[PDB]
Amino acid sequence: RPMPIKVENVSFIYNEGTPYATVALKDINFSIDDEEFVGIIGHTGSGKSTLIQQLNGLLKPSKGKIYINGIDITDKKVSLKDIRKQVGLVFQYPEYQLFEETVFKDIAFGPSNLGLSEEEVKERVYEAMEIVGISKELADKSPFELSGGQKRRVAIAGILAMRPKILILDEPTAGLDPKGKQEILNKIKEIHDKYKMITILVSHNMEDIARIADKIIVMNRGKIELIGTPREVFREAERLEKIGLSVPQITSLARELRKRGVPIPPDVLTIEEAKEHILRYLRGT
Amino acid sequence: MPIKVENVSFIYNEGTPYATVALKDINFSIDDEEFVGIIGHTGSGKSTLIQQLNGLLKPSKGKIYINGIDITDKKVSLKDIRKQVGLVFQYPEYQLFEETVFKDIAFGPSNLGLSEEEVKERVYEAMEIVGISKELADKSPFELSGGQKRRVAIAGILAMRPKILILDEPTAGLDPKGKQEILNKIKEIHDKYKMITILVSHNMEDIARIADKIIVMNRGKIELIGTPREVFREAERLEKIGLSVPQITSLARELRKRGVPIPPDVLTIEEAKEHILRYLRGT
Ligand SMILES: CCCCCCCCCCCCO[C@@H]1O[C@H](CO)[C@@H](O[C@H]2O[C@H](CO)[C@@H](O)[C@H](O)[C@H]2O)[C@H](O)[C@H]1O
Ligand SMILES: CCCCCCCCCCCCO[C@@H]1O[C@H](CO)[C@@H](O[C@H]2O[C@H](CO)[C@@H](O)[C@H](O)[C@H]2O)[C@H](O)[C@H]1O
């Protein structure tokens, strides 16, 4: 240690002033360890977006502290550049933030604003391009002549070009076809394992979250409702249902078979796991 | 037959050396009261197709009959078409809005001339259907939540009382309860008003539960047409063309391969539960 992420008693209120003041986060505590894949789920207006903005410094806590790899990022001594070297944040439909004249220039934007020599930038740009799987020959193309998917690659390379070891993605499969969805999730997981990252994935898709995550943070009206492994979390089917969420289809089935007598775990997370339990139970009867 | 599409093609930049065929020889029909799902990979021509159906695009070739009327004839206006077909685009809340909720919902029916006493009825009926309080009528749309804005946008379309309703990915961006709620209301309005509804979606699980018929697109062609069972039995083909089957269908498939008497085209957890319990009570 230090644990790479610790959020210590954080609250946030928009416009703390002020008759516009509106509480969005209340007493948030958690920590995330090395190499953990984390899922954040919760209803619309539960605070997920506000939270992830605390982690990369777009918002400062109204109370409490956030330590990234042992650095209190809430201290005035720590800039929004220092933070970008540790934490990258990919918003939804990040392709709509492409701005620059060429792919190379768009990817370079961040690291050039970070300072960094031209040699540094150029190596980071090409390293990023390779990681997200876009040919080096696209470097001199206009972003606005690329695929939807290609654009989304370029937007994400811009963030990775800063080599953060914490990567936050807000609904990265949004708008994609079903093959697109698996491809981005596979590539996220592959980059996670390869570079020993923390990855934080915010999503309304319970099925994806359940397959990919080591740990899930469940938000509810600005609070942490629950933290646990996907099994632990999706065992609370009745509670999730009441706070705007859901369980994966396959988990609901396991649940429904249990109610009627079948000795299947109620926290089966994947088709493969369900298959294996159901067949094993049949072989045993 | 309320919808008949005959030999339709469409070309982007028809000019022009940048010309691109997006739709090629489309043929199908949709019967009274059918809930139809349209699925297909990104760029397979789904959006282009639906815009043919409400006249926002005209076919390069071929014809489209709505309630017997060739809407591709120059004699048929956009207004005529908007009385029969409503089209709800993705994230319809990011459209601009009029000054108040009432005015925004009233826009379409007021453009229809139409007794303003009857505009008011259409507005308040539409508000009830999409679940927004009558007390929001005077509010400016910017004071509403994203979900509320989406309700208002949809009420504007329903206030026209179309009998064909087309929705492009209506659950987009919503939380899981949101997603179930919009799909329940869509189905409820469908059954109640005897509509045709057309839902374009990348979510195979939703499309499977709700549709009577599915149109599967692939590189600008119809690849297949059939019931959800018929379509999702073609698992290997769907995989090849950018799509997928519902999780529960995959499971059923995988259990059938290993000896379980479960149909490979189970579409819902409920069906899968019944089949599995039957095999246990059966031996
Ligand atoms: C064809 C018919 C047309 C139907 C149109 C209906 C569209 C339905 C849109 C539902 C929008 C999202 O649906 C709902 O949104 C509200 C916020 O606005 C969410 O959020 C709500 O959370 C809780 C419930 O968990 C509320 O007490 C809280 O004030 C609010 O945050 C719900 O958790 C979400 O499920
Ligand atoms: C952490 C880094 C992550 C970066 C990488 C993340 C993005 C990975 C997924 C990119 C999205 C792929 O998304 C999409 O998938 C479908 C599969 O049907 C492709 O496939 C289809 O599209 C085109 C239409 O123009 C057809 O000509 C093509 O034959 C067909 O296969 C789409 O062109 C692609 O845009």
UniProtKB/Swiss-Prot annotation, chain B:
Organism field: Caldanaerobacter subterraneus subsp. tengcongensis (strain DSM 15242 / JCM 11007 / NBRC 100824 / MB4)
Gene3D superfamilies hit by this protein: P-loop containing nucleotide triphosphate hydrolases (3.40.50.300)
Main location: membrane
Function, in words: ATP-binding (A) component of a common energy-coupling factor (ECF) ABC-transporter complex. Unlike classic ABC transporters this ECF transporter provides the energy necessary to transport a number of different substrates.
Keyword Cell membrane (UniProt): yes
Assembly information from the UniProt record: Forms a stable energy-coupling factor (ECF) transporter complex composed of 2 membrane-embedded substrate-binding proteins (S component), 2 ATP-binding proteins (A component) and 2 transmembrane proteins (T component).
Protein's UniProt name: Energy-coupling factor transporter ATP-binding protein EcfA2
CDD domains in the record: ABC_cobalt_CbiO_domain1
Catalytic activity, EC: 7.-.-.-
Keyword list, A-Z: ATP-binding, Cell membrane, Membrane, Nucleotide-binding, Translocase, Transport
GO cellular component terms given for this protein: ATP-binding cassette (ABC) transporter complex
Superkingdom field: Bacteria
Binding site for ATP: G40, H41, T42, G43, S44, G45, K46, S47
MF annotations from Gene Ontology: ATP binding; ATP hydrolysis activity; ATPase-coupled transmembrane transporter activity
Domain ABC transporter, residue spans: 3-244
One Pfam family recorded for the sequence: ABC_tran
Subcellular location: Cell membrane
Membrane association type: Peripheral membrane protein
Family statement: Belongs to the ABC transporter superfamily. Energy-coupling factor EcfA family.
